[PDB]
Symmetry: none
Subunit: 295 residues, 2 copies
């Protein structure tokens, strides 16, 4: 049968996804089945399960898979095959024109640093979307293309690093598409006094409070965002409730993953307006689990 | 290693269901896979694929199976086995006490005349339902049970016939359950002047217009009228359905199956210029040679 022998069975990955589907009553939404059999074909990877909370509404059909090897061409190729297979449904149309623009030419795949393929499915077909993430490093030509696709004003350009660029693609099943850039700072970097003091100019002290808890901090820039999204990579999931006063709907998601085996780290995404409110009512929560072979 | 040479292979039954799932992009809703495993174990039967239209919303996860042999105890038992296999998922709550009350005692299975088991699935788990239909004849003790269970109003007793009762059970996956009676008329009845004349009083002339094309007319106890068309080609003339429902009808004009179909809709939809809320039923028989 197989040729490559891992210690990770494909059932382990689908069980982690299945635990998410059971906890939050995720019934089959297109193309969840196609995404799961795509997950079963992957090698070493990290799977992120997520919940998007808007007031008392919960959207939990959010899963991302990060490839944990350096085969960038193959992993991009297989992710796009999933995008093309999902687009085979007659009443679905994916607009890949912005991804085609980014990948056009003699694309140097040796500049790719990280790849994620994901979903965010709703009961509304047109409101569901598929996702592709690509991080590139020291690639001026394609960083320029990505910046132009994002239509970043010179103010947002000052947020972007020149050594790395984290790019996300959204593909709604009704033809809508968007690009997003995620400039980030590591703990050693936003602890630099010459960087943290400038953060005091652009961000409120409420948005700066959880920084001692984080190994990563970033912002999402996209024409599709109502406002810039703040991203916090927490080092310890147990520190979350002391600094992020989420509502009960988001609390059900976080309480479930306080007891799920996997990474101790987590990610929270929310607007700066939510950080200044007394209670977080609109937020994304991300939790992950690693699947790596011991051979 | 099987036993019966006459056993129908389930492949053609499942491809008929598969053509329906493919045509309307049906997700693996629960418990569609269990129902297909149940269909695979059946013998001679009619498989009915259906679509419910609400204006521009289509719900195509609607499949029924009518047993064709007279092994009534066996077919009821296997149907209940499917009902209990579906109920075994922890987040599902199936209440079967209405069916348990009807089948209680020393049930006379020789009085059964027709059995059907089916599904009507939705994206919301609690809104999906499993179905079981039983027709009994000249069974006064159990016809009284079904009458009592339906809270039969006197003016609705005037619709039932003395020696037959078509009873349908609904089992929603959230615990809700229901039972209702289906009075019926055959073509020799609703075309006879003695019955058709007094039908002109209780029914509008628009609801009576499709009767020349029918061999079966019934009411589901707003009341829903059922039309059993003899010929699928006559449908679009007397039923101006919208384009959402036209998508289902156009598909089954091209599919192999029985030339007869069934349309279910309220009397208000008959008096409408276009038909926006309608059920469409198409079938294909599977008999052994
Ligand atoms: Mg985003
Ligand atoms: Mg009904």
């Amino acid at each position: 049968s197989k040729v490559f022998k891992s210690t990770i069975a494909p059932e382990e990955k689908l069980r982690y996804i299945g635990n998410h589907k059971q906890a939050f009553d995720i019934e089959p939404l297109y193309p969840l089945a196609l995404f799961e059999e795509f997950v079963a074909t992957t090698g070493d990877c990290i799977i992120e399960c997520s919940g998007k909370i808007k007031q008392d509404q919960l959207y939990p059909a959010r899963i991302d898979l990060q490839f944990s090897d350096k085969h960038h061409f193959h992993n991009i190729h297989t992710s796009i095959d999933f995008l093309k297979r999902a687009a085979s449904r007659t009443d679905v149309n994916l607009n890949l024109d912005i991804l085609a623009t980014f990948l056009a030419g003699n694309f140097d795949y040796s500049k790719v640093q990280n790849i994620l393929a994901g979903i965010d499915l709703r009961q509304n077909l047109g409101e569901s979307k598929l996702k592709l993430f690509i991080r590139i490093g020291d690639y001026p030509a394609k960083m320029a293309v990505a910046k132009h696709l994002c239509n970043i004003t010179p103010e947002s350009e000052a947020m972007l690093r020149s050594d790395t660029l984290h790019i996300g693609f959204d593909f709604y099943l009704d033809g809508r598409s968007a690009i997003e850039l995620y400039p980030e700072l590591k703990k050693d970097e936003f602890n630099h006094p010459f960087i943290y003091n400038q953060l005091k100019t652009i961000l409120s002290p409420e948005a700066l409070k959880p920084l001692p808890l984080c190994n990563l901090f970033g912002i999402g820039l996209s024409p599709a965002n109502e406002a810039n999204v703040l991203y916090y990579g927490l080092e310890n999931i147990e520190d979350f409730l002391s600094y992020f006063p989420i509502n009960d709907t988001a609390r059900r998601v976080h309480d479930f993953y306080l007891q799920q085996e996997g990474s101790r780290r987590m990610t929270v995404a929310l607007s700066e307006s939510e950080m200044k409110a007394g209670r977080i009512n609109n937020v994304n929560l991300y939790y992950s689990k690693a699947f790596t072979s011991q051979n």
